[PDB]
Amino acid sequence: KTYGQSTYSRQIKQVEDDIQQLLKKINELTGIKESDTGLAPPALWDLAADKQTLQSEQPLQVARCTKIINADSEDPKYIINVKQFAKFVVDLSDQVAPTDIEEGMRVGVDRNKYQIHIPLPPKIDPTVTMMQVEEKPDVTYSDVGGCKEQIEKLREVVETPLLHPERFVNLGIEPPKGVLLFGPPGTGKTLCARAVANRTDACFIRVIGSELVQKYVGEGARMVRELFEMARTKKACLIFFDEIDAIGGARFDDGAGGDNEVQRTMLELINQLDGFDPRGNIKVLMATNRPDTLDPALMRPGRLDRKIEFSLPDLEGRTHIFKIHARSMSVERDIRFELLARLCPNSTGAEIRSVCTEAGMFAIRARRKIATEKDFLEAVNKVIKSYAKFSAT
Amino acid sequence: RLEGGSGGDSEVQRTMLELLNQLDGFEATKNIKVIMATNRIDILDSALLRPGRIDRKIEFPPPNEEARLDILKIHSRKMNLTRGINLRKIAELMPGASGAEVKGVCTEAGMYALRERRVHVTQEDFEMAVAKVMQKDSEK
Amino acid sequence: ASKLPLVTPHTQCRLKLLKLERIKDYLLMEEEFIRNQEQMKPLEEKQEEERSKVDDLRGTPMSVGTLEEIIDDNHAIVSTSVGSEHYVSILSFVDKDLLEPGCSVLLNHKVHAVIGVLMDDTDPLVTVMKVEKAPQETYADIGGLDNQIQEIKESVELPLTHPEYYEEMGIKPPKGVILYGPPGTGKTLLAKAVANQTSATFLRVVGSELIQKYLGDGPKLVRELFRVAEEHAPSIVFIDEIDAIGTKRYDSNSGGEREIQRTMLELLNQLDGFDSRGDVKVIMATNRIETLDPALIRPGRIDRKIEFPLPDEKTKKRIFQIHTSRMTLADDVTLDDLIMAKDDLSGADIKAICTEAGLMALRERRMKVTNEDFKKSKENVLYKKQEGTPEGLYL
Amino acid sequence: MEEGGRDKAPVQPQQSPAAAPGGTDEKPSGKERRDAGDKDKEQELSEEDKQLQDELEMLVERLGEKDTSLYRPALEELRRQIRSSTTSMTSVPKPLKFLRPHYGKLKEIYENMAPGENKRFAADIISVLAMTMSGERECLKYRLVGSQEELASWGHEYVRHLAGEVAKEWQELDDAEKVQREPLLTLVKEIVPYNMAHNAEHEACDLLMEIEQVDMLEKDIDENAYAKVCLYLTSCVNYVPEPENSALLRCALGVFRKFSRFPEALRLALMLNDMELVEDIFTSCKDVVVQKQMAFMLGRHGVFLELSEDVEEYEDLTEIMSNVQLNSNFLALARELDIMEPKVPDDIYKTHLENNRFGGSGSQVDSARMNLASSFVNGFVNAAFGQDKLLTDDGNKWLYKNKDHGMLSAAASLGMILLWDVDGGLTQIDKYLYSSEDYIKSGALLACGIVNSGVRNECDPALALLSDYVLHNSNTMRLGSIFGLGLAYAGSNREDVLTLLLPVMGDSKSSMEVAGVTALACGMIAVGSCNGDVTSTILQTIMEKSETELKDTYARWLPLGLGLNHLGKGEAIEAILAALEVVSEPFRSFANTLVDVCAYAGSGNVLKVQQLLHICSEHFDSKEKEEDKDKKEKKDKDKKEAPADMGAHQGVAVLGIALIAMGEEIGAEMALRTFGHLLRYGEPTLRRAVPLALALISVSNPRLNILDTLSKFSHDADPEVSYNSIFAMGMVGSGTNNARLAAMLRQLAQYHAKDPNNLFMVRLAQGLTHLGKGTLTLCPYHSDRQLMSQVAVAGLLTVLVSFLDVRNIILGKSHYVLYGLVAAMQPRMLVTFDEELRPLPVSVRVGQAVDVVGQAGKPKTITGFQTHTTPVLLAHGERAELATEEFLP
Amino acid sequence: XXXXXXXXXXXXXXXXXXXXXXXXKXXX
Amino acid sequence: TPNCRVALRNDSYTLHKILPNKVDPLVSLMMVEKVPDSTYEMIGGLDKQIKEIKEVIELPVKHPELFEALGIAQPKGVLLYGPPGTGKTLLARAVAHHT
Ligand SMILES: Nc1ncnc2c1ncn2[C@@H]1O[C@H](COP(=O)(O)OP(=O)(O)OP(=O)(O)O)[C@@H](O)[C@H]1O
Ligand SMILES: Nc1ncnc2c1ncn2[C@@H]1O[C@H](COP(=O)(O)OP(=O)(O)O)[C@@H](O)[C@H]1O
Ligand SMILES: [Mg+2]
C-alpha cells in the first residue's frame, strides 16, 4: 500500500493537519464575519468605529484636486482649472508658504471658497511606474566570475563616480556617461545588469525595449519624456535598456513606406540623450545580441562610449563558474573541475548551470539523498553525449 | 478571433464564446441540428470548431439551365402573373445568371406590369426585363 | 492566517514535531480561554451594535467611484463617474489589502470619503485562453511512449505534485520543454493529457493567432499573457506552434516581418530576463526544430528537448485498437493486414482510417464492419497523403 | 501493461524460495547455494536506487512472508552459516513485507541473529536496505527498552555499536546534508540519555571532519533554542567541547556558553571562563572573547585576571572594564558628533510648530504638569554626551520654581545627560548639588549612580551615596540614596554593600516607598545566591503586608526583587522554595505568580504556559484577584521574547483575539504591556493594531488605563515614520484626552523614539539570541505601571530612569590595534539559512553597503568582503578585531 | 499589417439644477 | 429581477415601486418559427448536394440506431458555402420539412 519514508511520517503530518483545521474551527466557534461584500473583519474596527471617525468626519474636508497654469505678480493670483469643471483665478489659504506652488502642479483646492490647501505629487502614469524596479536582486559581483577585464571596465564607469566623486575632480575629467554591452548570448549581460542594480545607491530604472512600440502615434515618444523628467528629479539615477534593436536600428528609406513610427520614437531618444541642455547625472547601459545594424547616431561617442564584449572565457573561467555553481549544492568532497572544464571547451555559463541542474536529476533518477562525484561523472558522461548529438547541434 | 481581443473585447466575440460554451455543454444533437451557410469562408475560427462542434462542408456551384428554371418558378411564385409564356426560353436567355439576379427580374416584370396599368404579367414584360437585368449584368 | 512562518527543518526532524505542537498548544488554549467567554459572560456585544454604529455612520445612498492613486495611509485620490476627482480620506472599515489602483470603491455625499469597496468581476482573458476543465482522455489514449511520458512527468508533474527532492539538494527544476517531431505524432495529445491530469492551471495558446493587423499588439498580448498567468495561480503555459512565428532573423527585412521580430523579442524578455517569474511552467511545441532562433534554444530558457519518433508495428497495435475500441468489429478483419505492411504512417493517419471506415459503412447503409471498409479506407488515406506529394522517382 | 513473458524474477524466485522448504531437509546443497544465489541476487537487485520497484522485494513476499514464517522459526536447527544467509536476505524487505505494526517485530527476522557486519551488504545503499529500518528500530524498539530499562540486554548492548556505525555512515556514504540526520538519530535514541549517546558521538565527531563541523554545530543550537528542560540541560553542555576538542574555533566560548551558564552550572561556565584562561594564544581571539565579559551580557569578572601575568596579558582586564568603555565613550564623543549631532537639537518640541495654525490660533495649553515633560526636551536628547552649560536653564528655573517630584526629576535628568561617564560626571552634579533641599540633592545624588553606571570602578562604593543615606530622618534622602548605587552596581554580585544596604530592609522604619524600592535596588544586584536577601525581604513582608489588605506598593515592589534574585532557571526548585515560603492569604499569594515565572525568562516550557492561564482564567471575579490575573498576564510577556520569533507570532495571535476583544479587565486595562515588552523595533502589524484600540480610548473606563497603553506603545525605539501616529494623536489629544493628566505622557511618548539618533539596543538579545540582563532594569517599569497614582508622586522616581541598560548601538568599528581601519562592510536583512544546499547565501538585502560606523537595526547580520578574512568570531558582536590575510591569488 | 492609427474625442454633456430659492441682492 | 426598471427617490435614493418591463427586446424580436414547407425534390441541378444533406442530417434523425449500433456520434453542425443566392437559404428551408 505504502511505506514509511522517514520514521513518524504521518505522525507529524495529521498533528499539523488537524490544528490547521482547528485554527478554522476556532474562528467559527468565536463567530467570524467573512466575505461581507467588501468590509473589514470586526475584531479591529469595533475599537475604530466610534468618535475617532467623527474626528475624520467633521474636522476633515473633501479638498477637490486641480492643476495650476500660471502665477501673477506682487501677489499669488493663481489661474487654475479643476479638470473639466471651470478654470478659476483663486488664492492660497494661509496654511501654506508661497514657495512650492510652482506652475504645472497638481494641487488640492477647497470646495466651498476655492482656495488652495495642499500641493500634491504629480501624475506619473502606472505604465512607467511598473518599470521602476523598487527592489534590488541578490546578485554578488563574485557570481559573474570569469570576466575580470569586462567587470573592471564597467566598474570604472558606472560605479566609481557615483561612489567616489573625488578622483575625477582632482584630475579634471568627465566620466563616459554611456556604456554598451554586447556579445554572444547566455554570457553574462543580464548578470552584470543585476549586479550593478544590486550595489547601485541610486534610482535604478528598468526599461524593456519593446515596451515603447504601441498602436497610436506619438504616445511612444511621450514615454521617453516622462523617463527623462523623472531622471532629472531623481538625482544620479541609472537607466538600463535591453534589446535595443526593437527601439530602432535602421532608417530604411528605399521605399520609405515601411517602419516610421519606431524611427520617430528613436529620434526622440536621441535628443533627450545628448544635445541641448545636457542631463547631468544619468548613466545608460545597453545590451543587445547584434550590435551591427544599429543607427550610427547612437554609435556617436558621448552617447555610447565603451564597447564591452563578452566572450567564452578560456579554460579557467569555466573552472571558476563550476566553483560558483557547484559550491552551492550538496556534493562529495572528491571534487575536481579541471577534468570537467577540459571536457566542455566551448560552452556558456548557462550551459554550465544546465549541467549542474542536470546532475541533480540523476540523483532523483536514482533514489538518493546526495550528489556523488561518480553520479556527477555520470552527469557529465551523458551531457557530453547529449551535446554531441543534440537536436539543434 | 482575438483580433478584436484584449483591445476592448468588442462585445461580439464574447457572445461567440457563449456560443461555444453551450455547444461544449451538452447536446449529442438530442433531436436538434444547427445549420449554418456562409460565403467568405476562410476568416473565422473553424479549427477550434472542427472537433465535435461543427462538421462537413458542402460546396455550391454556379447554377444551370434546369437550376435557374426552378429558381425562376420559385421566386416568381408569389405574383399575379399571366400564363401563355415560355419560361424555358426565359431561363435559356441567361447563360450565367445567379439565383439572386432572378429575383430582380421578377420585380422588373411586376414593374412593367404596373406601367401597363394591368394586373396581368405578360411575356412582353419578362422579355424586356431579361434584356434589362443582363444589361445591368454587362459590367464584367 | 499567517500564524507562524517557519518551515525550515522540512523533514521528520524533531524540531517540527516540537514547534507544531507548541502551535497546537497556543491554539487550544486560545480556544479554551475564549470558550469560557460564551460560558460565563455569553453576551452578544456586536451583532448590530457594531453594524448600526457604522451603517448610521455611512450614508444610506452609496456611490461608486474609481481609484486613481494611493497616498500615504488614509487619504487617496479617487474619480467620480464624470471625472471630478476628490482627495478624500478612507476609513478603517474597508480592506486596505485588496485596495489596488483601478478598482471600484464606495463613497460618501458630504465629505465623499471612501467607505467600502465593491468586489471585482472575472476578467474575460481567462475565459478566452484557458482550457477551463479537464478536456479529454487520460493516459489510456496514448500509444506506448513510456519514455516521453517519463520526461514530461519529472519535469512538470513530479516537481509540482511532490516537491521534496529538489529542496533537499537545493537544485531548481529545469524551466522550458520543447516538443518536436514530424506532424501527426501526438504533440497536442500529450499537452492535453497533462492538462487532463493536473493540479495547477493550464493555458493553451495557438501561436499563429499572435499576429495582429495593428502593431504593438504583438508584444501587448504577450506581456499580458504571463501577467495573467503569474497573478492567477500555479500555472502551466502551453504555446502550440511557435515554429512559423518565431523562427530567425532570416533576411532582416521590414514591413511586418520586423514587427514579428519585435514580438519575439518581447517574448524572449518576457520569458526570462528579470525577476524570475516563479511557478510558471512553459511548454512549447513545434514541427520543425532546425530553423529556430538559438537565443531561445539556449539554457536558461529551455532545458529539455524531446524527440518524437514514429513506431512501426508495436504501439500501433494499441493505436489501431484504441481508435477501434468504441465501435463494432465483425470477425472478417485483421489489423495485422495493415500494421505489419507499412511502417511510417502517423497516428493521425490511423485516426483518419478509423473514422473513414465508419464513414464508408454507414454511407452504404450496411451493417457493422467489413474488411473492404479497411481496404478502401487505407487506399483513401494513401491518396490523402499522395495527392499533395510532388515526388517523382528518387527526387 | 506489457507483462508476461519477461517475468523471470516473478517465477524462479517464486519457485525456489517455495522450493526452499522443499529443499531444506534432504537437500543440504539446495538449502544454502540457492539461498546464497538468492541472497547475493536480491542484494544485487537492491543497491542501485534507480528502481524503487524491485522484481523480488515487492514480488516474493506474496508467498515469501508465509515462507519465512515457516522457514526461519520452524526449522529449529539453524546452523552457523544458514542464519547468515537467511537473516541477511529476509531482514531486507521486512519494512515493506509488514504493514504499520512492524514496529514491535523488526526483531522476529533480524534479532534471531544480526548476521555479521550488516553494512557489508548495506554500505553503498542510502536508505532502502536498513538505514530507514534502523531509524525504525531506534524509534519504537529501543525507546520501550530505554524508557526504564536502558541498562539491559542485546536491545541496548549491540544496539549501541549498531547505531555507532550507522551514525558514522551518514557522514560516510557521501557526507550529505543528512549529517543533521545523525542528531535525528542521536536525539530520538535515548532522549534523556542523550549525553550517553553524545559521548560516543562526540569523539566520533572529533575524528569525523573539521569542515563538516559547522552545520551540525549550528543544528545543535538550532535544537537548543528550545527543548524539554532536561534536554535543554543535556545537549547544551554536549554543544560546548566541539569547538574545544574537534575544532578550535573557540572564540564562540564566552557568549555561546553564557547559553550554558545558567542551565547546567554557574561554575561550569566559570570553568569555561577558566578554559578562556587556558587557551591564551595569543591576544586577538583572546581580546574579543573578553570584550563581551564586561558590558555585553554580564560583568562581575574583574577579580579573576589579576593573577601572575599582570603585564599585558592580564592587564586587559581593566582595559576591558573601563578603557574600552571609555573607547565606548569615544564612540559618542568622536564618531557621533561627526555623523549627525550638535549638542542641542532641542527641536522635537519645536516640531510642534504647525499645531498653532491648525484650527485658528493656539497658546491655550497652560498645564503645569506639561512642565514635567519640559525637562525631557532637555532630558532624552542629551544622552551620549549631550552636555549642557546653561542649556539646562529650563530645568534651573523650574528646579527653583515648584514641583517637588519635578525638582527630583530635573535633577535626575542630569545623570542621563552625562551617560557612561566617570571623568567629570560628579563635577557637573556638585555645582547643581548644593541647594540644601530634600528634592534637589536626592534627585542629583540618585543621578550620580546613573553617571557611573556600567563603570563599577572606584567612584563611591560607600563614599557618596552611603554618606547620603545615613542623613535619613526624613523623605527621599531615605529613599533616593539606595537607588543609584544599586543601579550603579547592578551588574556586579558584590556581597559587601548588599550587607551595607540590608539594614535598610532590616531597619523596619515604616516608610513604605523606601522599603519597596529597597527590594528593587538589591534585586538589581544579585540573581543567584544570598538566600539571606530572600530571608530579609520576607521578614518585613510578614510584618507589614500581613497586617494590611491594601495598595500594590506592597505588591509591585517587594516580591519583584525576590524574582530578580531568582531570575533565569527552569529547574522548578525556586518555585518550590518561594511559593511554599509565603503560604498565606491570596492577596499575599499575589506573589505566587512572581518568582514562579521570573525564573522562567525564556525557554520552551509550554506546560508552564498552560498553568499560566488555565488556573486563573476568568472566574468573573468581582474585584478581588483582578490584579492577580493582570500579573499572571505580566508573566506571559516573558517566555515569548526569546524563542526567536516562535511564540512571538503565537503571542500576537492570542492576545489580539483572546484578551483585548473578549475579555473585561485583563484585556481592557493591562494586556498591552506585552507589546511594550515583546517587540522593541516596531512593525506595522502591532504598530497599527494598537491605535486600533488606542485612538479609540473607550473613555468609559478610568481612561488613563488606555492612556497608560498610549505611553509604552511608544516603547519601540530606533526612530521611524511613526511621528504621524503620535503627533496626530497629540492633536486630538490637546483638548480632549485632557492635558491635566497626560500632557506629560504624550510628549513622553513623543520624545522617546528619538531618544538620541542612536543607542536604541534594548532588545535583551546579543550575538544572536542570548539575554544580557538587562531584564532586571526594564521589568521594574512595566511592573510599576499598575496602574494610576504614580503619574504624580511615586512613579517619577521610576518613569524617568527605570531602564538604563542600553548597550551601545552599532557594529561598525574595527579595532585593529591602532584603531584606524574602517571596514568594507555590507548590511542586510536577517538570515534565513538553516539547512539547505551548502554553503549558503547568508542574507538577502545585499543592496546596502557601508564601510564604517553605520547602524545596527533589528534584523541585521552584517558581513564583509575584500578578503580581510574577518577571522575573529564569525557570529557578530560589534567589536570585531579584523586581522588581515590574502593568501588567495 | 504594421499600420498605426490616431484618435478622437466624444465629450459628455453636462447639466445642473437647484432649489432656486436664493435671492441675489444683498447690495444696498 | 436583474435588468429591471425601478422607481427611485431623488433625496434618499430609496426604491418606491418596481416598474414593469417595457417589452422584452429579445422576446419582442423573437425569431419566427414559421411553417416548414418544402418546395420538393424539384430543385434539380443540386441533387448531389441534396444527397449529402440527407446523409448528414436526415440519416442521423431518421436512423439513430445505425449510429447506436455502430457506436459513432451523430453530427449537429453543417456548413454550406458557395456564391450567395444559389440556394443557401432555400435548401435548408426545404430539408427541415422533409424530416
Ligand atoms: N560568466 C558567468 N558566470 C556565471 N554564470 C553565468 C555566466 N554566464 C552565464 N551564466 C549563467 O547563464 C545565464 C544567462 O545569463 P544572461 O541572462 O546574462 O544571458 P544573456 O546575456 O542575458 O543572454 P541574451 O544575450 O540572450 O540576452 C545566467 O542566469 C547565468 O546564471
Ligand atoms: N500514440 C497515439 N495514440 C493515440 N492516438 C494518436 C497517437 N498519436 C497520434 N494520435 C492521433 O493523432 C493526432 C495527433 O495530434 P498531434 O500529432 O499533436 O497533431 P500536431 O502534431 O499536428 O499538433 C491525435 O488526434 C490522435 O488522435
Ligand atoms: Mg539578456
Testing ligand 2's pocket by substitution, the residue of C142, C149, C152, C185 carrying the most ligand atoms inside 8 A of its CB is: C185
CA distance C283 to C175: 9
The secondary structure element, H or E, covering residue D465 is: helix D465-469
- The secondary structure of C165-181 as a DSSP string is SHHHHTPPPP-EEEEES
CA distance A14 to C94: 36
Q: Quick check: helix, strand or coil at residue A33? A: coil
Q: How many helices (H) and strands (E) does chain B have?
A: 6, 2
Hunting for cell 488555565 — which residue is that?
Answer: D614
Q: Cα of A240 to ligand 3 centre, how many Å?
A: 12
Query: Which ligand 2 atom minimizes the distance to the CA of C347?
Result: 9
Q: What angle do CA F88, F91, F97 make, to 5 degrees?
A: 145
Hunting for cell 517630584 — which residue is that?
Answer: D405
Q: Quick check: helix, strand or coil at residue F81? A: strand
Closest CA to D346 of D877, D875, D756, D810: D756
Residue pair C209/B1 in contact (Cβ under 8 Å)? The answer is yes
Neighbours of A150 (CB within 10 A): 20
Task: Say whether C3 and D610 touch across the interface (CB within 8 A).
Answer: no
CA distance D437 to D443: 10
Which residues contact residue C392 at a Cβ distance below 8 angstroms, ignoring those fewer than 6 apart? none
End-to-end CA distance of chain A: 45
Dihedral over alpha carbons D35, D39, D40, D46 (to 10 degrees): 160
Closest CA to D716 of D757, D762, D670: D762
End-to-end CA distance of chain F: 40
Angle at which helix D512-523 crosses helix D558-565, to 10 degrees, equals 10
- Grid coordinates representing D51 are 528502481
User: Quick one: DSSP state of residue F8?
Assistant: E
- The secondary structure of D818-873 as a DSSP string is TT-----EE--BPP--SSSSSS----S-TT----SS----SSB--EE-TT----S-
- A chain contacts of residue C118, beta-carbon cutoff 8 Å: 37-38
- Grid coordinates representing C257 are 516581418
CA distance B87 to B105: 12
D509 CB burial (10 A radius; 0-12, 13-18, 19+): exposed
- Grid coordinates representing A13 are 503530518
CA distance A112 to A109: 9
CA distance D25 to D42: 23
- The secondary structure of D14-82 as a DSSP string is HHTTTSSTTSSTT-TTTTTHHHHHHHHHHHHHHH--S-SS-TTTTTTHHHHHHHHHHHSSTT----SSH
- Grid coordinates representing A243 are 534589446
CA distance D291 to D282: 15
CA distance D636 to D641: 10
- Grid coordinates representing A380 are 557529465
Residue pair A84/C134 in contact (Cβ under 8 Å)? The answer is no
- The secondary structure of A98-144 as a DSSP string is TTS--SS--EEE-SSS-EEEEE------HHHHTTB--S-----GGGG
Residue pair D747/D373 in contact (Cβ under 8 Å)? The answer is yes
Hunting for cell 554531441 — which residue is that?
Answer: A388
CA distance D198 to D151: 16
The secondary structure element, H or E, covering residue F77 is: strand F77-81
Testing ligand 1's pocket by substitution, the residue of A189, A191, A242 carrying the most ligand atoms inside 8 A of its CB is: A191
CA distance A269 to A143: 33
Exposed e or buried b per residue across D165-179, where buried means at least 16 C-beta atoms within 10 angstroms of its C-beta: ebbbbbbebbbbbbb
- Grid coordinates representing D10 are 516473478
Neighbours of C323 (CB within 10 A): 20
- Grid coordinates representing A350 are 548557462
CA distance B84 to B120: 11
**How many Cα atoms sit within 13 Å of A130 on the Cβ side?**
8
Instruction: Give me the sign of the Cα torsion angle D302, D308, D310, D312.
Output: negative
Task: Say whether C213 and E3 touch across the interface (CB within 8 A).
Answer: yes
Helix-, strand-, coil-residue percentages of chain C, each rounded to 5: 35, 15, 50
Neighbours of B135 (CB within 10 A): 9
Residue pair C353/C378 in contact (Cβ under 8 Å)? The answer is yes
CA distance C288 to D198: 63
Q: Which residues are registered as beta bridge partners of B113?
A: none
CA distance D488 to D521: 10
Closest CA to D97 of D64, D130, D67: D64
Query: In whole angstroms, how far apart are CA A341 and each of A315, A337, A352, C63, C174?
Result: 6, 6, 9, 69, 22
Instruction: Please tell me whether the peptide bond between D774 and the residue prior to it is cis, using omega within 30 degrees of 0.
Output: yes
Dihedral over alpha carbons D303, D309, D313, D314 (to 10 degrees): 10
- Grid coordinates representing D497 are 554593600
Q: Cα of A130 to ligand 1 centre, how many Å?
A: 24
* Chain C closest-CA separation from residue E24 CA (Å): 25
Distance from the Cα of residue D506 to its chain's centroid = 36
CA distance B96 to B107: 19
Of D645, D646, D834, the CB nearest to C22: D646
Residue pair D734/D718 in contact (Cβ under 8 Å)? The answer is no
Which residues contact residue D756 at a Cβ distance below 8 angstroms, ignoring those fewer than 6 apart? D336, D341, D380, D381, D383, D384, D386
Which residues contact residue D13 at a Cβ distance below 8 angstroms, ignoring those fewer than 6 apart? D38, D41, D42, D55, D56, D59, D60
Residue pair A192/A144 in contact (Cβ under 8 Å)? The answer is yes
Task: Say whether D832 and C8 touch across the interface (CB within 8 A).
Answer: yes
Closest CA to A24 of A10, A34, A38, A14: A34
Angle at which helix D229-239 crosses helix D214-222, to 10 degrees, equals 160
Which residues contact residue D427 at a Cβ distance below 8 angstroms, ignoring those fewer than 6 apart? none
The secondary structure element, H or E, covering residue C285 is: strand C280-285
* Chain C closest-CA separation from residue B10 CA (Å): 12
Instruction: Please tell me whether the peptide bond between B26 and the residue prior to it is cis, using omega within 30 degrees of 0.
Output: no
**How many Cα atoms sit within 13 Å of D843 on the Cβ side?**
16
Distance from the Cα of residue D503 to its chain's centroid = 35
Alpha-helical regions (H) of D207-301: 214-222, 229-239, 266-276, 284-289, 292-295
The secondary structure element, H or E, covering residue F60 is: helix F59-62
Query: In whole angstroms, how far apart are CA D293 and each of C108, D877, E26?
Result: 63, 12, 85
Q: Quick check: helix, strand or coil at residue C75? A: strand
The pair phi, psi for residue C90, each rounded to 5°, is: -90, 160
Query: In whole angstroms, how far apart are CA C148 and each of A80, C145, C317, C350?
Result: 69, 6, 19, 20
CA distance C390 to C270: 41
Distance from the Cα of residue D369 to its chain's centroid = 39
Q: Cα of C224 to ligand 1 centre, how many Å?
A: 25
Bridge-based pairing state of the strands F15-18 and F6-8: antiparallel
Is the CB of C131 within 6 Å of ligand 2? no
User: Quick one: DSSP state of residue C92?
Assistant: T
- Grid coordinates representing D200 are 560516543
Resolution in A, one decimal? 3.3
- Grid coordinates representing C304 are 529539455
Alpha-helical regions (H) of D715-771: 723-732, 739-753
Is the CB of C187 within 6 Å of ligand 2? yes
User: Quick one: DSSP state of residue D791?
Assistant: T
Hunting for cell 435671492 — which residue is that?
Answer: E23
Task: Say whether F76 and B55 touch across the interface (CB within 8 A).
Answer: yes
CA distance F38 to D6: 68
Residue pair C235/C280 in contact (Cβ under 8 Å)? The answer is yes
Dihedral over alpha carbons F38, F40, F41, F42 (to 10 degrees): -120
Hunting for cell 450496411 — which residue is that?
Answer: C366
Q: Which residues are registered as beta bridge partners of A139?
A: none
Closest chain F CA to residue B35: F78
Query: In whole angstroms, how far apart are CA D609 and each of D214, D599, D636, D652?
Result: 33, 13, 7, 15
Task: Say whether D178 and A369 touch across the interface (CB within 8 A).
Answer: yes
Query: In whole angstroms, how far apart are CA D601 and each of D228, D480, D523?
Result: 15, 29, 15
- Grid coordinates representing A103 are 506652475
Hunting for cell 548588599 — which residue is that?
Answer: D498
Residue pair A119/A101 in contact (Cβ under 8 Å)? The answer is yes
CA distance A187 to C379: 54
The secondary structure element, H or E, covering residue A321 is: helix A316-325
- Grid coordinates representing D445 are 545624588
Q: Cα of A50 to ligand 1 centre, how many Å?
A: 58
Is the CB of C297 within 6 Å of ligand 1? no
CA distance A68 to A56: 28
Which residues contact residue D21 at a Cβ distance below 8 angstroms, ignoring those fewer than 6 apart? D67, D70, D71
Task: Say whether E1 and C213 touch across the interface (CB within 8 A).
Answer: yes
Q: Do chains E and A touch (3 or more CB pairs under 8 A)?
A: yes
Residue pair C253/C208 in contact (Cβ under 8 Å)? The answer is no
Residue pair B130/B95 in contact (Cβ under 8 Å)? The answer is no
* Chain F closest-CA separation from residue C369 CA (Å): 9
Dihedral over alpha carbons A40, A44, A50, A54 (to 10 degrees): -60
Q: How many helices (H) and strands (E) does chain E have?
A: 0, 0
Exposed e or buried b per residue across C221-257, where buried means at least 16 C-beta atoms within 10 angstroms of its C-beta: bbbebbebbeeeeebbbbbbbbbebbbebeeeebebb
Largest Cα–Cα distance of chain E, in whole Å? Answer: 73
CA distance C353 to C327: 13
CA distance D546 to D591: 13
